[PDB]
Each structure stands twice: as C-alpha cells, then as structure tokens.
From Swiss-Prot:
Monomer. The lineage of its organism: Viruses, Duplodnaviria, Heunggongvirae, Uroviricota, Caudoviricetes. InterPro entries: Pyr-dimer_DNA_glycosylase, Pyr-dimer_DNAGlyclase_EndonucV, T4_endonuc_V. This is Endonuclease V. Changing residue 15 to C: 40% decrease in enzymatic activity. Changing residue 15 to A: 30% decrease in enzymatic activity. The record marks 25 as: Transition state stabilizer. It comes from Enterobacteria phage T4. Changing residue 86 to N: 20% decrease in DNA glycosylase activity. Its EC number is 3.2.2.17, 4.2.99.18. Changing residue 118 to N: 5% decrease in DNA glycosylase activity.
Length: 137
C-alpha cells in the first residue's frame, strides 16, 4: 500500500488508479484495530514522512488528510474519463477522533514521494501513460 504526497493532477494514470484503490485500505485497517481494542498510542508513528517500513502506520493519526485526498483522487479519475465505480468519499465519522488528524507535508517530504514515483516510471516508461498518452520515455 503506498500513499503519495504529490498533486493528484500530476500522477501518471497507473499511479492515480493504484492510489485510488489503495488509500482507502488504511481506513479499514484502522477499523480493524479499533475493534481489537487498539488506541493511537499503541502505534509507532514516525515523526516525519517515510516510504517502506512504517509508511502506512505514519498515516494512522492522519485519516482526515487521507479523506481529503480521496476526494481529490476520485475527482481526478473522473476528470480523465476513467470509469470508476465508487465515486463517494467513505464516511469515517465512526472512527475515534484521535485517528482523524490532518497533515501538511513540507516540500522536502513531497520530494521523497515524488522521487519514488519518478524512479518507478524510469524503470519501464512504456508501462506508464498520462491521459492515455505515452509521454514518458
């Protein structure tokens, strides 16, 4: 599961579709943990954004950030003419407030996220498209 920090209008089609599919998984994971009696204090949340080990957990107390980003992802999918089936933002008001924080990444954090996306495309640029156009080489 990978959450990106870059503007959704700048994502390659493949990356946009992947994040649309994967971001909501975090909500379900928190629900599962809440049902198991866990609290935010039970998690080791990094103080700064990271990729890899601890990436998903970093967002456990930042669900409002994710909710707002899911709004943007859906809108970008529709803008590109993609046929997505769920066009509604998930209601997360059932999750305890301590997990529903917001977040504003610094440009240095965004640069880490951007570098990972760049690196993936560079591997085989023909696998990526933007509005269906092969602009990556």
């Amino acid at each position: 599961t990978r959450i990106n920090l870059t503007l959704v209008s700048e994502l390659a089609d493949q990356h946009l579709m992947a994040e649309y599919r994967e971001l909501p998984r975090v909500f379900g994971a928190v629900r599962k943990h809440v049902a198991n009696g866990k609290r935010v204090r039970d998690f080791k949340i990094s103080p700064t954004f990271i990729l890899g080990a601890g990436h998903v957990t970093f967002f456990y107390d930042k669900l409002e950030f994710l909710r707002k980003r899911q709004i943007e992802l859906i809108a970008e999918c529709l803008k590109r003419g993609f046929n997505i089936k769920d066009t509604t933002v998930q209601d997360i008001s059932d999750i305890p407030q301590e997990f529903r924080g917001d977040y504003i990444p610094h440009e240095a954090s965004i640069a880490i996220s951007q570098a990972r996306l760049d690196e993936k495309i560079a591997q085989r640029p023909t696998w990526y498209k933007y509005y269906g156009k092969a602009i990556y080489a």
